[PDB]
Design a protein around this ligand. Structure first.
Ligand SMILES: Cc1cc2nc3c(=O)[nH]c(=O)nc-3n(C[C@H](O)[C@H](O)[C@H](O)COP(=O)(O)O)c2cc1C
Ligand SMILES: Cc1cc(Nc2ccc3cc4ccccc4cc3c2)n2ncnc2n1
Ligand SMILES: O=C(O)c1cc(=O)[nH]c(=O)[nH]1
Length: 378
């Protein structure tokens, strides 16, 4: 669709909610509108020149929704139908968690930034799996959901003993319904602050996850069409989400581990705790998203692309609002882009607008297709 009065109507309403209403209340209200399917669709064809892929995972367009937006997979269809090629649901944990004390999400309109200390609030693996299953069933009968990718972000409980025990439990429950799994070792907001990113630990963590996935394939007697009730009809790829608050050595050490473990991709990056010059946020705890994160994460993409010798596919996040923002991420080495803050500040038109902007920009820079632009800034 577009341009629409439908889009425009909701973007007035959203700007109103932004001025007057609590962020988390607004988010939940819009998730609820999405669940009842009264939000706009982008029914347009995506440019065959902005297709992209990660290994054998194929994206109709280079834009997805980041993790934390739909933690419980209650709104997947409606978010996808806004014009995104994929969504990363979660982060989920083996059991439900309330998360930290409310209010825990604050916005700063002028810097177009967000700070949050949610602390992995989610309904837990079992309920979210049931939600994802219902989505997969709907997807079989919904033409606008065909070839759309759902990844699942997985983490640990707040009091949990061993992180790995948690990841394995999630994999066994939800893995069959996922096109990829994102390992969340990077959230500030669960104590660590980082769920362990230390290279030896990570290596163990990556290996354990691949194995669980492998195990699902071995244990089951059904053919793949049947086992993988997902989009790809294959086993989920394994990504890891990294925090930008690391030093060059830590980054070098992580880069080696990713190569050693043969990880399918890295999501660069999560929220930062290194931002200070946001006045409204000075009394606040958590990680910062949005425009202030942009250059930090772009620089981080560049480094990890270099350190991994261009061998590991990158998913970019965040501070991405414009087609230019997207191209910067792509030329630094990202194959695909995730949006979060952009939806908060720019509303229903985020995917429609950013796709148009990037298409026009890819054209006016001589690139024949998107894949030509990946890593070209180096
Ligand atoms: C309120 C909120 C909740 C989030 N929850 C998660 C989460 O559950 N898991 C995760 O990996 N990232 C989470 N994130 C981080 C985002 O996925 C994203 O990486 C970050 O916002 C940077 O993108 P952006 O600048 O476009 O917002 C959350 C971010 C915010 C704003
Ligand atoms: C005003 C505001 C909004 C918001 N969240 C949004 C914004 C856009 C959304 C679009 C959707 C589109 C389809 C389905 C669900 C959707 C859910 C949405 C949720 N937040 N979050 C933290 N502060 C916020 N302030
Ligand atoms: O749940 C959260 O608090 C959270 C998780 C995460 O990975 N990143 C973030 O900024 N917040």
């Amino acid at each position: 669709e577009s341009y629409n009065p439908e889009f425009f109507l909701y973007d007035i309403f959203l700007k109103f909610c932004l001025k007057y209403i609590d962020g988390e209340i607004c988010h939940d209200l819009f998730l609820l509108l999405g669940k009842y399917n009264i939000l706009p669709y982008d029914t347009s064809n995506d440019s065959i020149y902005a297709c992209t892929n990660i290994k054998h995972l194929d994206f109709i367009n280079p834009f997805g929704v980041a993790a934390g937006f739909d933690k419980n997979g209650v709104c997947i269809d409606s978010i996808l139908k806004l014009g995104f090629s994929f969504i990363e649901i979660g982060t989920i944990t083996p059991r439900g968690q309330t998360g930290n004390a409310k209010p825990r999400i604050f916005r700063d309109v002028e810097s177009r930034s967000i700070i949050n200390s949610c602390g992995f609030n989610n309904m837990g693996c079992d309920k979210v799996t049931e939600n994802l299953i219902l989505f997969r069933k709907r997807q079989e009968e919904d033409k606008l959901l065909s070839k759309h990718i759902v990844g699942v972000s997985i983490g640990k409980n707040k009091d949990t003993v061993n992180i790995v025990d948690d990841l394995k439990y999630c994999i066994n429950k939800i893995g069959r319904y996922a096109d990829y799994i994102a390992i969340n070792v990077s959230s500030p907001n669960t104590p660590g602050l980082r769920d362990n990113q230390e290279a030896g630990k990570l290596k163990n963590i990556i290996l354990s996850v691949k194995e669980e996935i492998d195990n699902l394939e071995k244990n089951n007697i059904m053919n793949d069409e049947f086992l993988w009730f997902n989009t790809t009809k294959k086993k989920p790829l394994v990504f890891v989400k990294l925090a930008p608050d690391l030093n060059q050595e830590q980054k070098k050490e992580i880069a080696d581990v990713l190569l050693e473990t043969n990880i399918d991709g890295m999501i660069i990056s999560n929220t930062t705790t290194q931002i200070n010059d946001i006045k409204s946020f000075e009394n606040k705890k958590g990680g910062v998203s949005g425009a202030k994160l942009k250059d930090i994460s772009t620089k981080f993409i560049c480094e990890m692309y270099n350190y991994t010798n261009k061998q590991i596919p990158i998913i970019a996040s965040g501070g991405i609002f414009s087609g230019l923002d997207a191209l910067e991420k792509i030329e630094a080495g990202a194959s695909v882009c995730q949006l979060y803050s952009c939806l908060v500040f720019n509303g229903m038109k985020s995917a429609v607008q950013i796709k148009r902007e990037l298409n026009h920009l890819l054209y006016q820079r001589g690139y024949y297709n998107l894949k030509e632009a990946i890593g070209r800034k180096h």
